[PDB]
Amino acid sequence: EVETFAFQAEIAQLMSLIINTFYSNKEIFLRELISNSSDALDKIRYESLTDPSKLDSGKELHINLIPNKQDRTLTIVDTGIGMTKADLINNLGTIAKSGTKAFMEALQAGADISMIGQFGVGFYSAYLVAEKVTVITKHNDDEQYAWESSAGGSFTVRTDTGEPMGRGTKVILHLKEDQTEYLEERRIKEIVKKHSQFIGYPITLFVEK
Numbered sequence: 188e189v190e191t192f193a194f195q196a197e198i199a200q201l202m203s204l205i206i207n208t209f210y211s212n213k214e215i216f217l218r219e220l221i222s223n224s225s226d227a228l229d230k231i232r233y234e235s236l237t238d239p240s241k242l243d244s245g246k247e248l249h250i251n252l253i254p255n256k257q258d259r260t261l262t263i264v265d266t267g268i269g270m271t272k273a274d275l276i277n278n279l280g281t282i283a284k285s286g287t288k289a290f291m292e293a294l295q296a297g298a299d300i301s302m303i304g305q306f307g308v309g310f311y312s313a314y315l316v317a318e319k320v321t322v323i324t325k326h327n328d329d330e331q332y333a334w335e336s337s338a339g340g341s342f343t344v345r346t347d348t349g350e351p352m353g354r355g356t357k358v359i360l361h362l363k364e365d366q367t368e369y370l371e372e373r374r375i376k377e378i379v380k381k382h383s384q385f386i387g388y389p390i391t392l393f394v395e396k
């Protein structure tokens with residue numbers, strides 16, 4: 188059972204800008220998604236200090252980068268707090284409306300797309316390189332869900348039937364045809380060293396066989 192929702196008008200406007208604007212510094216998407224993973228890991232770690240049972244769904248706190256040349260997908264896995272069903276459909280987009288609005292006013296004032304993280308909407312920079320984004324997430328208080336959007340003004344949410352995650356978020360980027368450089372090992376290493384050298388959790392690059 189799949190439910191289809193419409194993006195909030197400001198978010199759909201931002202996504203259309205991100206895909207259609209000519210902007211060559213696309214590598215900032217990985218910094219934004221790693222920063223998102225670091226924030227999610229900070230939250231579950233903070234919550235576990237007063238309730239250690241929140242780590243029953245997994246003690247390890249890490250970020251995994253998994254490129255797949257065959258599927259042309261770059262996957263970013265974290266064992267953070269995860270996202271509930273209300274997070275995917277309503278609450279996180281509601282928090283993002285103001286940041287989205289301010290980001291586009293800035294872009295009209297000559298600001299750069301690379302400053303998307305300062306407005307707390309850095310996730311949508313994934314569409315700089317991805318034609319479709321699939322998000323598998325599991326929160327301690329909810330079931331495992333699958334969020335997906337190829338932009339165009341709509342996204343889908345469904346209960347995920349695949350492999351159980353325990354807890355965390357998996358961001359699967361279905362890369363555009365001309366953005367396969369982010370499946371290269373040495374390219375991912377350069378981006379992580381340049382943008383994410385100060386993340387307080389282990390970032391592991393999965394080398395393909």
Ligand SMILES: CC[C@H](CO)NC(=S)N[C@@H]1C[C@@H]2CC[C@H]1C2
Binds near residue numbers: 310
């Ligand atoms: C980067 C912050 C921004 C705030 O809205 N996005 C987050 S934290 N999550 C989003 C909600 C849906 C599930 C993943 C995306 C789409």
